[PDB]
Amino acid sequence: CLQNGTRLLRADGSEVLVEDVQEGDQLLGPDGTSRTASKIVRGEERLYRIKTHEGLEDLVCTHNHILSMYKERESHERVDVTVDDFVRLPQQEQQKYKLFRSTDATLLHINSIELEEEPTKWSGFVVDKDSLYLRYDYLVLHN
Ligand SMILES: [Zn+2]
């Protein structure tokens, strides 16, 4: 699940805050096709903040959120990993995993991932098809 205030793309390209996503809403998939959101859930807890080397917005999500990543050795493979599992990996293994944006480099390098000191509100849902959808800046997100 994602911190409230995360900016996503509706299927028509307009922006929607993650907490404004309603049952049945249509979001944008990484291939440009539609995705349907369902099972809206909300909570409040200490989230993990992920900052990249590149100048894009931090990603703030729950400990059980699934990151969709490319892991080194074409040269990379697609891997899904929860924040918990990723946080516990040695940093030398952490190299190899990169976040990614939908191809119109598109790989993003994580500089830090840290548990935040105070709880904040989050919103989550499930998405059909490949469970992937787009942040407003085309960062590829998983359910
Ligand atoms: Zn979610």
Author numbering: 1 to 73, 90 to 120, 133 to 171
Task: Give the text the authors published on this PDB structure.
At the heart of the spliceosome is pre-mRNA processing factor 8 (Prp8), a large (approximately 270 kDa) and highly conserved protein. Prp8 helps generate mature mRNA by coordinating critical rearrangements at the catalytic core of the spliceosome. The intein is also found at a highly conserved site at the center of Prp8 and thus is at the core of the spliceosome.
To further understand the mode of zinc binding, we turned to crystal soaking in zinc acetate. Compared with the native form, the complex does not show significant conformational changes, as is reflected by a small overall RMSD (0.17 Å) between the 2 structures. There are 6 molecules per asymmetric unit cell. All 6 molecules bind 1 Zn2+ at their C terminus with the terminal asparagine (N171), and 3 molecules bind an additional Zn2+ at their N terminal C1. The Zn2+ at the C terminus is coordinated by the main chain carboxyl oxygen of the N171 and 2 water molecules. Zn2+ binding to either of these 2 catalytic residues prevents Prp8 protein splicing.
